[PDB]
XYZ file of C-alpha atoms in Angstrom:
330
model
C 86.946 36.694 150.408
C 84.947 39.545 151.878
C 85.493 42.695 153.925
C 83.232 44.762 156.177
C 84.148 48.111 157.724
C 82.197 50.713 159.657
C 82.082 54.220 158.213
C 81.559 57.174 160.577
C 80.456 60.774 159.936
C 83.267 63.272 160.513
C 80.962 65.821 162.139
C 77.386 66.540 163.225
C 76.314 67.438 159.679
C 77.522 64.266 157.921
C 79.849 66.416 155.794
C 81.837 63.276 154.974
C 82.427 59.765 156.292
C 85.668 58.122 157.382
C 86.530 54.440 157.342
C 89.609 52.901 159.019
C 92.124 51.365 156.600
C 95.213 49.344 157.487
C 98.302 50.149 155.407
C 101.667 48.469 155.601
C 103.466 46.074 157.922
C 103.055 46.447 160.841
C 99.680 48.012 160.112
C 99.340 51.774 160.097
C 95.663 52.643 160.477
C 94.476 55.763 158.669
C 90.901 57.047 158.434
C 90.094 57.471 154.750
C 87.206 59.056 152.872
C 85.824 56.330 150.591
C 84.967 58.119 147.347
C 82.980 56.420 144.580
C 83.572 59.564 142.477
C 87.366 59.215 142.155
C 89.949 56.514 141.663
C 93.071 57.377 143.653
C 93.993 55.987 147.072
C 96.079 58.791 148.549
C 97.256 59.527 152.059
C 98.820 62.137 154.234
C 102.344 60.873 154.775
C 105.822 61.478 156.152
C 106.459 63.176 152.785
C 103.640 65.735 153.089
C 104.862 69.338 153.385
C 104.941 69.899 157.145
C 102.991 73.176 157.093
C 100.148 71.376 155.281
C 99.687 68.753 158.005
C 97.388 69.744 160.902
C 96.278 66.820 163.059
C 96.031 64.070 160.443
C 97.508 60.638 160.959
C 100.272 60.040 158.442
C 101.524 56.990 156.586
C 105.285 56.514 156.954
C 106.454 54.109 154.259
C 109.955 53.783 155.756
C 108.332 52.081 158.777
C 106.555 49.478 156.627
C 108.503 46.346 155.718
C 106.201 45.737 152.738
C 106.357 49.270 151.243
C 108.178 49.709 147.949
C 108.662 52.917 145.995
C 106.919 52.724 142.630
C 109.865 54.255 140.854
C 109.138 57.260 138.664
C 105.420 57.337 139.389
C 103.699 60.593 140.312
C 100.087 61.632 140.786
C 98.093 64.840 140.875
C 94.352 65.211 141.340
C 91.800 68.013 141.431
C 88.317 67.475 142.821
C 84.959 69.041 142.013
C 85.094 71.280 145.073
C 88.372 72.860 143.950
C 90.591 70.928 146.346
C 93.703 69.088 145.170
C 96.678 66.974 146.155
C 99.759 65.441 144.541
C 102.838 63.390 145.231
C 104.636 60.112 144.556
C 103.646 56.439 144.889
C 104.412 53.347 146.926
C 102.976 49.874 146.690
C 102.044 48.250 149.977
C 99.579 45.916 151.647
C 96.184 47.512 152.274
C 93.342 45.977 154.271
C 89.771 47.164 154.695
C 87.516 45.439 157.163
C 89.489 42.192 156.973
C 89.931 42.181 153.173
C 93.568 42.408 152.141
C 95.136 43.554 148.871
C 98.861 43.159 148.349
C 100.700 45.470 145.962
C 98.117 48.261 146.199
C 99.221 51.651 144.908
C 99.319 53.977 147.907
C 99.713 57.528 146.667
C 101.778 59.536 149.135
C 100.940 63.232 149.264
C 103.746 65.737 149.008
C 101.250 68.609 148.712
C 97.609 69.015 149.707
C 95.330 72.026 149.330
C 94.032 74.017 152.261
C 90.678 72.238 152.559
C 92.496 68.978 153.245
C 94.894 70.531 155.758
C 91.976 72.151 157.560
C 90.119 68.872 157.956
C 91.965 67.044 160.730
C 89.628 64.041 160.577
C 90.408 62.873 157.017
C 93.776 61.177 156.536
C 93.289 60.625 152.798
C 90.928 59.260 150.171
C 90.189 55.764 148.908
C 88.795 55.970 145.392
C 86.124 53.540 144.265
C 85.208 54.845 140.791
C 86.621 53.103 137.716
C 90.377 52.733 137.406
C 90.369 54.627 134.108
C 90.207 57.827 136.220
C 93.302 57.004 138.267
C 95.847 59.838 137.964
C 99.132 57.964 138.427
C 101.614 58.645 135.652
C 103.231 57.197 133.581
C 101.631 53.885 134.582
C 97.995 54.180 135.641
C 97.128 52.197 138.770
C 94.109 50.177 139.872
C 91.722 50.961 142.693
C 91.498 48.862 145.839
C 88.212 47.380 144.546
C 89.641 46.589 141.124
C 92.602 44.815 142.757
C 90.377 42.904 145.201
C 87.682 41.966 142.693
C 88.900 38.590 141.508
C 89.315 37.372 145.097
C 85.892 38.532 146.260
C 83.034 36.060 146.698
C 81.009 38.370 144.409
C 82.422 41.346 142.472
C 80.500 43.994 144.419
C 80.757 46.483 147.191
C 77.923 48.153 149.073
C 77.511 51.560 150.704
C 75.166 51.846 153.671
C 75.695 55.372 154.953
C 74.019 56.548 158.147
C 72.105 59.715 158.859
C 73.892 61.277 161.822
C 75.124 57.758 162.648
C 77.697 55.196 161.567
C 77.127 52.900 158.616
C 78.941 50.213 156.671
C 80.997 49.509 153.550
C 80.948 45.826 152.593
C 83.109 44.173 149.946
C 82.251 40.920 148.197
C 78.755 40.250 149.564
C 75.291 41.735 149.887
C 74.018 41.816 153.487
C 70.376 40.867 153.022
C 69.589 42.023 156.589
C 70.695 45.593 155.852
C 67.757 46.733 153.705
C 63.999 46.403 153.415
C 62.063 45.137 150.413
C 63.976 44.403 147.229
C 67.031 45.899 145.521
C 66.269 47.583 142.198
C 69.149 47.447 139.748
C 69.754 50.015 137.041
C 72.222 50.373 134.165
C 75.591 52.079 134.532
C 77.671 53.881 131.940
C 81.401 53.773 132.608
C 82.180 56.128 129.700
C 83.237 58.983 132.006
C 84.810 56.681 134.613
C 81.996 57.140 137.135
C 79.130 55.064 138.493
C 76.853 56.966 136.119
C 73.172 56.046 135.899
C 69.803 57.551 134.978
C 67.142 58.240 137.588
C 63.565 57.925 136.334
C 62.257 61.080 138.053
C 61.384 62.792 141.293
C 58.730 64.004 143.681
C 58.725 66.800 146.242
C 57.094 65.992 149.562
C 53.703 64.379 149.068
C 53.512 65.702 145.500
C 52.995 63.666 142.380
C 55.944 61.911 140.815
C 57.419 63.564 137.733
C 58.732 61.041 135.228
C 61.881 62.477 133.710
C 65.340 61.073 132.992
C 68.094 62.469 135.219
C 71.595 61.281 134.371
C 74.001 61.499 137.291
C 76.714 59.822 139.324
C 76.559 57.894 142.593
C 79.255 59.720 144.563
C 79.955 58.905 148.195
C 82.660 61.582 148.254
C 80.225 64.454 147.598
C 78.166 65.661 150.565
C 75.076 67.045 148.848
C 72.569 66.176 146.119
C 73.195 68.246 142.955
C 70.386 68.173 140.399
C 69.146 70.261 137.447
C 68.032 73.797 138.263
C 64.437 73.030 137.296
C 64.227 70.162 139.825
C 65.953 72.124 142.572
C 63.713 75.162 142.058
C 60.631 72.928 142.315
C 61.919 71.562 145.626
C 62.783 74.872 147.295
C 59.561 76.514 146.083
C 57.834 74.324 148.694
C 59.805 75.902 151.550
C 58.602 79.323 152.690
C 61.392 81.858 152.591
C 63.865 79.650 150.730
C 65.972 81.377 148.112
C 69.156 81.003 146.128
C 71.891 83.195 147.547
C 74.826 84.028 145.299
C 76.711 85.356 148.339
C 76.342 82.092 150.252
C 76.715 79.888 147.171
C 73.384 78.126 146.878
C 69.913 77.695 148.292
C 69.334 78.738 151.875
C 66.191 78.503 153.934
C 64.868 79.742 157.304
C 66.129 77.524 160.077
C 62.559 77.585 161.453
C 61.315 75.604 158.433
C 60.186 72.011 158.327
C 61.625 70.612 155.086
C 59.650 68.344 152.749
C 61.025 64.994 151.698
C 62.481 64.420 148.235
C 61.883 61.224 146.266
C 64.012 59.975 143.395
C 63.232 57.162 140.988
C 65.287 54.043 140.388
C 63.492 52.254 137.595
C 59.953 51.739 138.888
C 61.179 51.962 142.498
C 61.353 55.061 144.688
C 63.891 56.212 147.284
C 62.598 58.771 149.777
C 65.026 61.254 151.317
C 63.462 62.570 154.546
C 63.346 66.346 154.896
C 65.728 66.324 157.861
C 68.457 64.855 155.626
C 68.292 68.042 153.537
C 69.127 70.342 156.492
C 72.804 71.369 156.647
C 72.300 73.839 159.443
C 73.220 77.482 159.963
C 75.322 79.066 157.233
C 77.539 80.488 160.006
C 77.458 79.935 163.747
C 74.317 81.473 165.254
C 72.671 82.330 161.936
C 68.980 81.708 161.375
C 69.666 81.047 157.684
C 70.291 77.364 157.032
C 72.073 75.745 154.085
C 70.155 73.362 151.856
C 71.192 69.837 151.030
C 69.732 69.864 147.509
C 71.574 72.286 145.224
C 71.759 73.036 141.518
C 74.235 71.157 139.342
C 74.172 73.954 136.742
C 77.770 74.712 135.892
C 79.124 71.514 137.487
C 78.386 69.793 134.213
C 77.031 66.642 135.858
C 74.312 65.731 138.317
C 75.614 64.205 141.548
C 73.781 61.777 143.808
C 75.962 62.516 146.815
C 75.620 61.481 150.436
C 72.269 63.237 150.964
C 70.726 60.823 148.456
C 72.853 57.756 149.039
C 72.387 57.678 152.823
C 68.642 57.218 152.243
C 69.387 53.871 150.555
C 71.334 50.653 150.677
C 73.454 50.957 147.515
C 75.074 48.116 145.577
C 78.033 48.934 143.348
C 78.078 45.877 141.087
C 81.437 45.535 139.357
C 80.540 42.564 137.205
C 81.686 42.544 133.569
C 78.709 44.788 132.824
C 78.505 47.012 135.911
C 75.182 48.028 137.445
C 73.928 49.933 140.494
C 71.325 48.683 142.930
C 69.225 50.697 145.372
C 67.015 49.498 148.206
C 65.161 51.311 150.941
C 66.324 50.604 154.502
């Protein structure tokens, strides 16, 4: 089997992407944030504290003939940005782009933090990291991909995120029309539960490529590109007036700037992030200070190849017995 679903930016900055997901019988369609950096499929629901729901579409398990309470199971998750959610668990039928999993753990939120409430466009998350990170207790649950894997034509999914435009998540096949040139594959460590890999270096603009190993995660659920302070400083030094602002929370730059591109290495291959992808616009409405899309990972504890990087590539998440990641230009 295969699945193919369109993923759509939630706003004009590509802060996140939502993908329609069918849950239950009859189908209830929720728009979920597909997150290769976590491993829980959780939704706003009829159980979510009413004051914490503001415009989201909710899953109502009592209206699904295939929903079953997973008795005694609870979940609780905290994300890198400080947001969190928790609740109980149902199993139900879940379909993405025509690919159906029966008996999928659907984690129903009883509580969500303010950032989730405030984002009316995201009805929940669909985790696509390794199932070892799943938070359900006392019986850990599998991700949608892990459950689908054996049925897929090939044990892969691909992320093809758009810049200020829709893109695609495919399951079970590689669309050879969706990228240019060849796909370069690189080793993955699953030791921390992430799609963790090592970039071979970087360049800033038309500068020379610096060969240096950068360990990080491919994370569709993180907006920006978080890299070591040395790398980030070298980038922003090429933008007149750019500076790190502790009050704003990272590098800012004059909105009048033209940003240089940023290249990262995948083996001997190179992915080029155009400068425009690195512009996250005014820090506040009407400001002439703009927020940068490349930020330091210092004090995160891990480097993160988030959407800024991934949307410059066609990315293969290969879930074979020995997982790997593939990147192609597009």
